[PDB]
Amino acid sequence: ADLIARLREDGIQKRVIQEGRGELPDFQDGTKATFHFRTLHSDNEGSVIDDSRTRGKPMELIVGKKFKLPVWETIVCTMREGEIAQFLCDIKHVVLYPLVAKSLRNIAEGKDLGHADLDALQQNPQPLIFHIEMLKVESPGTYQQDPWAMTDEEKAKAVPVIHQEGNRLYREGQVKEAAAKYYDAIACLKNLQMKEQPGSPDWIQLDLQITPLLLNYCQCKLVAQEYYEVLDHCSSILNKYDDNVKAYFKRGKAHAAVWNAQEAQADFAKVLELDPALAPVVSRELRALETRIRQKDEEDKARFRGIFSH
Amino acid sequence: EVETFAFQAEIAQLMSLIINTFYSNKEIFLRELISNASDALDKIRYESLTDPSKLDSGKELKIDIIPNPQERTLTLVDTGIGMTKADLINNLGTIAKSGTKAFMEALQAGADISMIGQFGVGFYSAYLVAEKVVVITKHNDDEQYAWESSAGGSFTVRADHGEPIGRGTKVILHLKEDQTEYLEERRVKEVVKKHSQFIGYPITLYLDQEELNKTKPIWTRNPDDITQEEYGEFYKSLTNDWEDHLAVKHFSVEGQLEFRALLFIPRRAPFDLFENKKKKNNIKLYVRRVFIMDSCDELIPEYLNFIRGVVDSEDLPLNISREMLQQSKILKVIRKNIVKKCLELFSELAEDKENYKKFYEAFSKNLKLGIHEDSTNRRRLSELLRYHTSQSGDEMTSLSEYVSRMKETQKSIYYITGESKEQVANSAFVERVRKRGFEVVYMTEPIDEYCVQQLKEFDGKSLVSVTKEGLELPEDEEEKKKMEESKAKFENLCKLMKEILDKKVEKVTISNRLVSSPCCIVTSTYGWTANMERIMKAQALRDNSTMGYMMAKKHLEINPDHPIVETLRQKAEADKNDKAVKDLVVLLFETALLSSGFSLEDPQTHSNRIYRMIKLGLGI
Amino acid sequence: EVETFAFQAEIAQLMSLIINTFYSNKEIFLRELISNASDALDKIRYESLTDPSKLDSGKELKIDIIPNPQERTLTLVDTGIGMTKADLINNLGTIAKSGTKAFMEALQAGADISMIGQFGVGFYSAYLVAEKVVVITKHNDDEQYAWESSAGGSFTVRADHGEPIGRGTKVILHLKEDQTEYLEERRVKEVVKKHSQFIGYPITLYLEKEREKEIKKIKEKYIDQEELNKTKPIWTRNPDDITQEEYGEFYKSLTNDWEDHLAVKHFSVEGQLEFRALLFIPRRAPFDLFENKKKKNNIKLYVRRVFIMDSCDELIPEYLNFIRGVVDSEDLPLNISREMLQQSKILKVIRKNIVKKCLELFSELAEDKENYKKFYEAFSKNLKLGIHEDSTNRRRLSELLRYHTSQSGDEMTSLSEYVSRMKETQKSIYYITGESKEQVANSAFVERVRKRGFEVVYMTEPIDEYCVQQLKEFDGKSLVSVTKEGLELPEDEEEKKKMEESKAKFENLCKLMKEILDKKVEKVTISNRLVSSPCCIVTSTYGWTANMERIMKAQALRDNSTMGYMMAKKHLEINPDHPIVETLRQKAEADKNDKAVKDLVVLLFETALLSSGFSLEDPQTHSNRIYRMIKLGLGI
Amino acid sequence: MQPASAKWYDRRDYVFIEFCVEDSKDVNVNFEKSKLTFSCLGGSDNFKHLNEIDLFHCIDPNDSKHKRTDRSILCCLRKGESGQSWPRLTKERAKLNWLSVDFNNWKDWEDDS
Amino acid sequence: MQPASAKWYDRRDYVFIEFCVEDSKDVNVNFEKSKLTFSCLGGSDNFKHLNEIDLFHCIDPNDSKHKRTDRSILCCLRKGESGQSWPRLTKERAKLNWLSVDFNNWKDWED
Amino acid sequence: PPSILEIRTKNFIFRTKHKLDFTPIGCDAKGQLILGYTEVELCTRGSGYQFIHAADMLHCAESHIRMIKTGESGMTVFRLFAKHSRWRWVQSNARLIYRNGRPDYIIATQRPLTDEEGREHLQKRSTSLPFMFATGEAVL
Ligand SMILES: Nc1ncnc2c1ncn2[C@@H]1O[C@H](COP(=O)(O)OP(=O)(O)O)[C@@H](O)[C@H]1O
Ligand SMILES: Nc1ncnc2c1ncn2[C@@H]1O[C@H](COP(=O)(O)OP(=O)(O)O)[C@@H](O)[C@H]1O
Ligand code: BEF
Ligand code: BEF
């Protein structure tokens, strides 16, 4: 009886229409909520100004403590995948309406104007009827759970799964996905890094375990041909780990890719004097760079004979 | 029980104080005796207005000086009122007894007398240079008397039988053995000119008579009764220039701080201006027509150093030595009033729309320096500047006229800063502005950047440079979509070349102010512009550590209509990495960075790129 | 006959003169009272040294100041010698007579005491803040009296029967209603710290606060034994008995700095003008160093441990404005206000010694190369400005310079080391100037000089262009710049024939160039300094250096009229080894009227103009030349 | 009978007048809406002293007070309107030779900082 | 019986000492190679005053002379060898508390 | 010999003493007025918490790592507190003080900004971070 009582003790009046099917997915912290919605004016003949099918992309939600306004988090628990009814939101539960309304309209699918309805409604924060189209609720830990779902301990052990999976995809030949997941691992390790005081020992420890991941992510861009991404990541890395080897080889290769011969040779000298007796591939690279420079110069850029033909 | 005693003071130590610790200059004895003589003359004049018989013993009111190197006795005589024997005992032989102050307070009405001496010490300054002092005096009511002392506790008073003085005083100073410098007429003339120039009675000097204080003061006279020739003569006699004064202001302030001021603007600026740094004597402060102090940077601000003139008062506090005002607060009021009147003199001079040029060409730098420094008078000095424009041609014009010529949609004042007018009048920055028929300002002098740092606004209109970012020109709707679509069809190239540079430009966009050039470089909204940084890096006293705190970013912009950038965009589309694309983009950046006024570091890089292009094209 | 009178004095107007004219600041009454109390303490201490029977009634020596906010009285309490009845009458009731001076006249020669004041008008400064004054005094030769006055012509002396003082004096000051700001403690602390900080005895004050005390909140207002003279003087100690942390503590007290000093100089002079000074060089150069025209106050001046003045301008030159310290002495001629030094010609003598000792400190610090770098990186501009300002001590001031050179790596190096590292045939010393080291390193001017194995100094700061107008010589060596007309490398005897041969070969081409670049140059001559680039542009021998032109076009306040007078006189030289000159002469000989030759020579001039230290006029035409170049390069 | 030497200055609300009479006997002062009167037996030589002033504006006789010290008589006067500026103390413009401004207490209260 | 106050300074060839006595009676001042004795009886109070100081360096008893005005007694001492700077007046380095340098007409003549 | 006749400027640089945890223990003169928060209250108490706004205290760490390897934190921007709940931006470098062999404390050089400077420097700030998706933007 507590469900029915608590529903109607909090400014909410809902009638059971039809119950659903299946077990309950976890509604704990980190729970995902993917669904549409439809919004109806309580007294303005139900003018549907807000609706997900008018925009075409389903908005997600953060069920746990991370997100705000626990009214939404409560009302999601009431329904289930396929279960849809009408809701009526209390005045006290719509007090900060326009603040979120403008934020969500701005964070709608996303560009990278003016709206009189929004600021007029800002003048009058008023409750509405959200006939929310529930699609499904997922369970944390039961799939490729979202990186921001847990409290850093699941990630602390989960990241090796991502690393190994990316390696396996890479050696098979899948590159974009490997780069994406290495980026995701770097991101979770980075916002880990931004929780503890700098100058701590575990800080340096974290950096030590994340550096190979950053090199791995930098690797795929060479197949992807964004040599400048490689420059940006490597030059950031090497300001403090002066004694790595591949962290030199990759940026040397990138330098030599874009006709930056001078820095290419300068870097190759250092990578040789950190890793002696490994000449062959380096010789291949240096002389390929020189031959391509000479080739371009001899044929393509010799066109300038006319600059003083007059 | 109680015991009351007469509060006392002994004489030897007090005399030692007066001789030893009051006066630091040995030359001001002459200033003291001359002032005493002038007061003695004022007394005999005043007693003669209401009784013509007082002058039956002598008619001329003069002062003489009789240096005598044959026997080292400097002599000073006058034809004033004199003293009686009782006056001798009760006026000279008492340390802080002032006869003049007792004469002043016993005036039957508000008469026309303004005397100098008030302390009652100062006559004793004669012992700074003299071992023995004698005074031979005669007053109209008794017999001539003598007075003698050595400042050793006792003074004598004798009846006289010598050559009668007639009426007045004769103070004689037997000069010290090591101070026989004040008998030289160079020293005497220098001291008299410095200290007792503008005294109210003639001063002569027997070597062969010759008068010293020829020039009279004109600041006392009603300034509705002076002709320009009189002002010119006074200015010439004050500043030694052989030119006339360009302008003049002669006002007065009444109240608790009463003073008359008379200001001059020299015709041509001195060649050692801003550089002398040794003496800044241009506004001399007087109290009752006796010099007090030169401008120790409290009377007038530095940017009004060219002003010359006088400030005279009748009631200001002075220290014991009479060489310095007692209150610094007084000088703040004097400075405020003098600045306020100078800025009105300038405005009155600006009404003559022709003679104003001969003043601007001379002191525009001083006005701009004032705009930099003086934060309270900026809104009044901003109307005294005249600038070349894109429409005045060879004439310098105002900013008020600029507002009177602003188009119906014009909202701000556009300005550029460079180093030569013929260069700023053709830069890539102004091509579009000259197209829409707007008027820009050619501020092409180093101090202009300092002025613009502070101005930031004028008459509700705000200065906006064409070398900064996000320049907003009032423009119609037809272009409003052309520019947007151009930005939509240049994202690729803009980002690609921004990342080719990747370190030396902060951002890359589509230009808004070019017609013939394909690209240029503008600085950020804040921090230094190109010219400001170019000037700041050449100061020789610039604090090298704090450069970054006042640096500014860079911005590259693209003119989409230019054929070269159109072809470059066409090329880069087919291949995101062509070596020709990178080389030519770097060349365009170097050329634009040199065009926009920046100093290009490592110029041998640019030179060698050009040299190599010449190599290959020439066929070597 | 003759009649003799004694000089007299009118007491009323003499009082008026003292209270109205002598003293400008009204906060020096406290200075005078504190000085008087300190003198009274000195007297009793000196008399107690011989036989301690005098010190049997009160052993401590102290100065106590009691504000009385309700009763509007400021009280001094001193435990000094005190004054008897006759002393009260003769001393405090007679202007210009001081017993301190008579005491210093009376004691046996060779006594170690210095008491302040010989004017005898100091006490009456109290009426600047007080309506009427009470002086209650106890002395060991008679009972306790009370001296009462209000400066109006008379005073009353009475026997007192209050509570015992024991020994000493108590000056009570009933304040006038408009000066009731010398009761709050901010002001008294400010005055005591500014004026009488280094009095040689403890100075005590009473802060009536309430402490949060517990054993239900109780407010216990109470009387604090406070004091205001924590820091002693150290310039009165032997310069050997002081550790290097006592100096640091005193410096941190004096300048309110955060880090310790970098070098301290302690010295004393003997003679007619005697003083002892501490000078501190701070580790970090102060920001706002070259802006404050008024409140620099770097060096303070003391007399007998009493503050006199702080912001004189003849005390020290303005190129040593970072040196901070104190100067104290015993016999300077103060004025009646004790705020200005009479006949300021003494300041020149003080300044000479201060300058020479600071130079000695720099030289001594120059031996520890571990920490001289930190001094240079903070005051190199100051030393260069000093080179530019004064001429008497130019030599040693220049000797402290450090520079980067051709082969010095990332280490600054002096001039003497350069003379040591010099080739035996080197007649001169080579230098170059520019905006950055990287710009002058790869300058086309110095390429041959560097290749031939010579060693060239790099100046980088704009102050160096002023530093090189006076460095004519260093150890009798001629300093010459590679950017002028006559760069004189050591003449080899084998290349002279080649030089004259190429001169004959290219006289024609130089004359051809001279007639196309009309009034853009002054002459086209042959070069001997380029090895890796085509033609370059240099400056004349008696004109502004090409970088000096850039700097002189930035002085905001400078007059423009004389610009064409000192204006540069440019020169264009010829590389006879780059293929440009070869093809140029080859085209020229077959055609003196070609368009390509004229265009290319104009382009070379205008592209070597940027490589030097010059700025192009009408840069848009240069940009347009390169624009037509790029357009033809893409074929349009 | 001659007037006594006096000095004066002003604040935002008060105008101060100090009559430099040393050892003043039988001091009697009189205050009115626009009037001031002072009399005493000054010094020991028993000359008389009488000062008559036509005030430049209106004061409040019930609020003003005179407190005599041994050196001089100081009087403190309330203005008729708090803040009005007094360039001089008298109504007439003729300068009086027994009145001067006290530069050791003068201050610009109009332009506060 | 008691030493009198004194002020002093020097120049290229001369050493000037001034004794600050008022109304001096029958003063006696004697000169020798290295000592200067000054004897007076000043004031109506009739307090005797004597000063005996040994000199820093020798002076000339011939060229030296004295002058009694009233305010003080002036002593002119020509140095035994010109140019010799005097950092002090006596020989011993202890500070005779009755003596001080006169800065009202001091001069740094060795510039 | 042309003289040096340049007009001097009114730069507003001020210093403060930061302890090894970046917490202050005092400020110098010009800070006493630019911030306005007098010596004693920041010296003894300092509110207990950081004088750096949280949205900028994460950007102090990146300066610190340079500071501990070499000595200079480079050019960084913070947001101090002021007595009227104000926010005064600063451009700041830091130097640490070595006692014998080991660090002693930290003194920093700061330049204030008018709030427009901060707004323009902050509008770019919140986008230049290589973090992950903000989809379903809950919190930072
Ligand atoms: N030449 C003179 N003729 C008449 N009186 C004189 C003369 N010189 C000085 N006195 C008198 O000197 C007396 C005061 O001495 P002094 O120091 O000159 O006073 P003050 O400060 O007023 O100049 C006044 O009586 C003035 O009358
Ligand atoms: N607080 C005091 N305790 C004891 N004696 C004092 C005190 N103040 C002054 N005296 C004596 O009374 C005289 C007052 O003279 P003063 O005004 O102090 O002039 P000076 O400062 O030149 O001594 C001094 O000579 C001193 O000997
Ligand atoms: F000439 Be007096 F000293 F006023
Ligand atoms: F304090 Be006194 F003037 F020596």
Swiss-Prot record, chain A:
Q: Which domain of life is it from?
A: Eukaryota
Q: What GO cellular component is one of the record's annotations?
A: cytosol
Q: Which residues carry this modification: Phosphoserine?
A: S42
Give me the TPR repeat coordinates as residue ranges. Answer: 159-192, 211-244, 245-278
**Which GO terms fall under biological process for this protein?**
protein maturation; protein targeting to mitochondrion; xenobiotic metabolic process
Q: Does the keyword Phosphoprotein apply?
A: yes
Q: Where is the PPIase FKBP-type domain?
A: 30-112
**Alphabetically ordered keywords of this record:** Cytoplasm, Phosphoprotein, Repeat, TPR repeat
Name-wise, this protein is AH receptor-interacting protein
Organism of provenance: Mus musculus (Mouse)
From Swiss-Prot, chain C:
The modified positions for Phosphothreonine read T243, T425
The known regulators of its activity are described as: In the resting state, through the dimerization of its C-terminal domain, HSP90 forms a homodimer which is defined as the open conformation. Upon ATP-binding, the N-terminal domain undergoes significant conformational changes and comes in contact to form an active closed conformation. After HSP90 finishes its chaperoning tasks of assisting the proper folding, stabilization and activation of client proteins under the active state, ATP molecule is hydrolyzed to ADP which then dissociates from HSP90 and directs the protein back to the resting state.
Locate the region Interaction with NR3C1: 1-215, 216-554
Q: Which family does it belong to?
A: Belongs to the heat shock protein 90 family.
N6-acetyllysine-modified residues are where? Answer: K381, K427, K570
Q: What is known of its domains?
A: The TPR repeat-binding motif mediates interaction with TPR repeat-containing proteins.
- Chain positions carrying an annotated carbohydrate: S380, S398
Sites where Phosphotyrosine occurs are at: Y247, Y251, Y430
Which residues are modified to N6-malonyllysine? K345
| Annotated protein name in UniProt | Heat shock protein HSP 90-beta
* Annotated segments matching region Interaction with NR1D1: 566-636
Organism annotation: Mus musculus (Mouse)
Q: Which residues carry this modification: S-nitrosocysteine?
A: C536
Annotated region (Interaction with BIRC2) at 1-204
One Pfam match, given by its short name, reads HSP90
**Record site: Cleaved under oxidative stress:** I116, G117
Localization annotation: Cytoplasm; Melanosome; Nucleus; Secreted
Binding residue positions for ATP: N36, D78, K97, F123, R338
Q: Which PROSITE patterns match?
A: HSP90 (PS00298)
Residue span of region Interaction with TP53: 1-473
Give the keywords, sorted.
Acetylation, ATP-binding, Cell membrane, Chaperone, Cytoplasm, Glycoprotein, Membrane, Methylation, Nucleotide-binding, Nucleus, Phosphoprotein, S-nitrosylation, Secreted, Stress response, Ubl conjugation
Q: Which residues carry this modification: Phosphoserine?
A: S253, S391, S615
Which parts of the sequence carry N6-succinyllysine? K209, K477, K523
UniProtKB/Swiss-Prot annotation, chain D:
First-listed, main subcellular location of the protein, grouped into a coarse class = cytoplasm
Q: What is this protein called?
A: Prostaglandin E synthase 3
Q: Lineage, please?
A: Eukaryota, Metazoa, Chordata, Craniata, Vertebrata
Recount the PTM note: Proteolytically cleaved by caspase-7 (CASP7) in response to apoptosis, leading to its inactivation.
Q: Found in which tissues?
A: Expressed in testis, kidney, bladder and ovary.
Which GO cellular component terms are attached?
cytoplasm
Entire protein: shown range: 1 to 113 of 160
- The species this protein was found in: Mus musculus
Q: Does the keyword Electron transport apply?
A: no
Query: Where in the chain is the Glycyl lysine isopeptide (Lys-Gly) (interchain with G-Cter in SUMO2) cross-link?
Result: K35, K65
Domain of life, per the record?
Answer: Eukaryota
Residues bearing the modification Phosphoserine: S44, S85, S100, S113
The gene from which this protein is expressed is: Ptges3
UniProt-listed GO biological process terms: fibroblast proliferation; glycogen biosynthetic process; lung saccule development; nuclear receptor-mediated glucocorticoid signaling pathway; prostaglandin biosynthetic process; skin development; telomerase holoenzyme complex assembly; telomere maintenance via telomerase
Can you say where in the cell this protein is located? Cytoplasm
From the UniProt record, give the pathway where this protein acts: Lipid metabolism; prostaglandin biosynthesis
Sequence similarity: Belongs to the p23/wos2 family.
Swiss-Prot record, chain F:
Q: How does it assemble?
A: Homodimer. Heterodimer; efficient DNA binding requires dimerization with another bHLH protein. Interacts with ARNT; the heterodimer ARNT:AHR binds to core DNA sequence 5'-TGCGTG-3' within the dioxin response element (DRE) of target gene promoters and activates their transcription. Binds MYBBP1A. Interacts with coactivators including SRC-1, RIP140 and NOCA7, and with the corepressor SMRT. Interacts with NEDD8 and IVNS1ABP. Interacts with BMAL1. Interacts with HSP90AB1. Interacts with TIPARP; leading to mono-ADP-ribosylation of AHR and subsequent inhibition of AHR.
**Know the name of this protein?**
Aryl hydrocarbon receptor
How changing F81L affects the protein?
A: In allele AHRB1 and allele AHRD; no reduction in specific ligand binding
Q: In terms of domain of life, where is this protein from?
A: Eukaryota
Where the shown chain sits in the full protein? 268 to 407 of 848
Query: Where do the PAS domain residues begin and end?
Result: 2-69
Swiss-Prot/TrEMBL induction comment: Induced or repressed by TGF-beta and dioxin in a cell-type specific fashion. Repressed by cAMP, retinoic acid, and TPA.
UniProt gene name: Ahr
Tissue specificity of this protein: Expressed in all tissues tested including brain, heart, kidney, liver, lung, muscle, ovary, skin, spleen and thymus.
Misc = Although it interacts with NEDD8, it does not seem to be neddylated.
> PTM per UniProt?
Mono-ADP-ribosylated, leading to inhibit transcription activator activity of AHR.
User: Residues in domain PAC?
Assistant: 75-113
User: Could you give the domain comment from the record?
Assistant: The PAS 1 domain is essential for dimerization and also required for AHR:ARNT heterodimerization.
Q: Quick one: effect of changing A108V? A: In allele AHRD; reduced specific ligand binding
